[PDB]
Design an enzyme around this catalytic site. Structure first.
Site, PDB file in Angstrom:
ATOM      1  N   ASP A 104      -2.331  53.876 -23.562  1.00  0.00           N
ATOM      2  CA  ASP A 104      -1.391  53.058 -24.344  1.00  0.00           C
ATOM      3  C   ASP A 104      -0.046  53.767 -24.528  1.00  0.00           C
ATOM      4  OD1 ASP A 104      -3.099  50.800 -24.736  1.00  0.00           O
ATOM      5  OD2 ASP A 104      -3.100  50.961 -26.924  1.00  0.00           O
TER       6      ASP A 104
ATOM      7  N   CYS B 144       2.981  45.105 -14.005  1.00  0.00           N
ATOM      8  CA  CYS B 144       2.495  45.667 -15.247  1.00  0.00           C
ATOM      9  C   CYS B 144       2.961  44.724 -16.357  1.00  0.00           C
ATOM     10  CB  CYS B 144       2.987  47.105 -15.395  1.00  0.00           C
ATOM     11  SG  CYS B 144       4.774  47.373 -15.035  1.00  0.00           S
TER      12      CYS B 144
ATOM     13  N   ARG C  36       5.178  51.436 -14.692  1.00  0.00           N
ATOM     14  CA  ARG C  36       3.978  51.711 -13.884  1.00  0.00           C
ATOM     15  C   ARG C  36       4.092  51.119 -12.476  1.00  0.00           C
ATOM     16  NH1 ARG C  36      -0.289  49.899 -18.759  1.00  0.00           N
ATOM     17  NH2 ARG C  36       0.815  51.154 -20.359  1.00  0.00           N
ATOM     18  N   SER C  37       4.614  49.903 -12.374  1.00  0.00           N
ATOM     19  CA  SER C  37       4.779  49.263 -11.065  1.00  0.00           C
ATOM     20  C   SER C  37       5.667  50.099 -10.147  1.00  0.00           C
ATOM     21  CB  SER C  37       5.385  47.862 -11.249  1.00  0.00           C
ATOM     22  OG  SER C  37       4.513  46.980 -11.922  1.00  0.00           O
TER      23      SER C  37
ATOM     24  N   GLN D 197      10.642  54.116 -15.960  1.00  0.00           N
ATOM     25  CA  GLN D 197      11.224  53.821 -17.276  1.00  0.00           C
ATOM     26  C   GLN D 197      11.433  55.041 -18.175  1.00  0.00           C
ATOM     27  OE1 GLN D 197       8.217  50.633 -18.319  1.00  0.00           O
ATOM     28  NE2 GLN D 197       9.996  49.641 -19.246  1.00  0.00           N
TER      29      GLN D 197
END
Ligand SMILES: CC1(C)CC(=O)c2ccc(O)cc2O1
Length: 282
Positions: free
Chosen positions: A181, A215, A221-222, A262
């Site tokens: 998370d 994502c 994440r992508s 990110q």
């Protein structure tokens, strides 16, 4: 510089935030005018994450052809990817329309439906064989065929039917279930194992349309997934694998979708994954 020793040099000097901010400063800026039209407000999950006009995927519809999705085309590596946001309640039918129209074989999902107590994407596939889904706005039917649950990820076989033509296709759903998370994984080992399972399936190969990866926003994440894949493929193709410059590859990919990677922690994790992955390949 090479990668593994550039890596230790940034760790010892603690300059990951400065490296990452350089990337953000140099990244391309292109117009995203279609995404910002008022009729498309409920087609976008986040107001600051939009596809560029020059690389957006168009739906084969004359009313509204807009979806928050981008074609990342990597010329030297000879790989293409579609990066998209997690579907919204009012875009699940558009999502599957795109999968159909682009002839994709696989869907890669890097998030859970609920994280941090909030919904990160819609429940857009069926959870029981006998309870199929119909998307009436785009005239598609989706059925769960089989499911294989492992410790870090789940693979599902799905059948997508175009109800207009009665054609059917098999889609593979690759679902990475254990990204934390907060932060990034401590070891890249399970992420790399997952990437190799997607590869082995044929979903990334030229005989199919581009894989669809997402994502929640489709950039973090992508971005890690496609950056790691492309970098490893280039290390196999070139005479000198140490010439592969992960920052230059990231900047090339950011010509096609804004914001890929990110955080500075995601950047460091991408280095770690490519470094460890290059040892296993040989
Ligand atoms: C999902 C299933 C039970 C059936 C299937 O087609 C399949 C495909 C790829 C894979 O990695 C695992 C798989 O097991």
């Amino acid at each position: 510089m090479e990668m593994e020793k550039e890596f230790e040099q940034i760790d010892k000097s603690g300059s990951w935030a400065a490296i990452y901010q350089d990337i953000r400063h140099e990244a391309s800026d292109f117009p995203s005018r279609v995404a910002k039209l008022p009729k498309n407000k409920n087609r976008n999950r986040y107001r600051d994450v939009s596809p560029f006009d020059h690389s957006r995927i168009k739906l084969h519809q004359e009313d509204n052809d807009y979806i928050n999705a981008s074609l990342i085309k990597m010329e030297e590596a000879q790989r293409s990817y579609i990066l998209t946001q997690g579907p919204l309640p009012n875009t699940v039918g558009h999502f599957w329309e795109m999968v159909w129209e682009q002839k994709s074989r696989g869907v890669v999902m890097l998030n859970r439906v609920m994280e941090k107590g909030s919904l990160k994407c819609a429940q857009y596939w069926p959870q029981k064989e006998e309870k199929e889904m119909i998307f009436e706005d785009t005239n598609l039917k989706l059925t769960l065929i089989s499911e294989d649950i492992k410790s870090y990820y789940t693979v599902r076989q799905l059948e997508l039917e175009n109800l207009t033509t009665q054609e059917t296709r098999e889609i593979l759903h690759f679902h990475y279930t254990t990204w934390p998370d907060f932060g990034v994984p401590e070891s890249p080992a399970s992420f790399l194992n997952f990437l190799f399972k997607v590869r082995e399936s044929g979903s990334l190969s030229p005989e199919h349309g581009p894989v669809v990866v997402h994502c929640s926003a489709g950039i973090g994440r992508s971005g890690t997934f496609c950056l790691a894949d492309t970098c490893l493929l280039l290390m196999d193709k070139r005479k000198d694998p140490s010439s592969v410059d992960i920052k230059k590859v990231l900047l090339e990919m950011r010509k096609f979708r804004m914001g890929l990677i990110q955080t500075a922690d995601q950047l460091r994790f991408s280095y770690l994954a490519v470094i460890e992955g290059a040892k296993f390949i040989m």
